[PDB]
Design a protein around this ligand. Structure first.
Ligand SMILES: [Zn+2]
Length: 66
DNA sequence: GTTGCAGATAAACATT
DNA sequence: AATGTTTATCTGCAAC
């Protein structure tokens, strides 16, 4: 349900991937990772209208996992 | 057989 | 300058 999905933590709506918070509050891929690592509400001063982009990270597959 | 969703990695940026 | 930190892009799996 992307339609209407707004980041509960920073209200952004241009997320690369929609994540969910432990409380069930929709969040943008950035808040979900930043929040999980620091578990604190970050000011919207880091929110950017459009999505930032960069040269694509080297192409890599993966490794076998236990 | 195709789409969409969730999650993780590595690189690059900022700081000092 | 190196480390720590951050975020965008990739791949996979499940249900119909
Ligand atoms: Zn957010």
């Amino acid at each position: 349900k992307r339609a209407g999905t707004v980041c509960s933590n920073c209200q952004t709506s241009t997320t690369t991937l929609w994540r969910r918070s432990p409380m069930g509050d929709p969040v943008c891929n950035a808040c979900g990772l930043y929040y999980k690592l620091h578990q604190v509400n970050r000011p919207l001063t880091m929110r950017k209208d459009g999505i930032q982009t960069r040269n694509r990270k080297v192409s890599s597959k993966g490794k076998k996992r236990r």
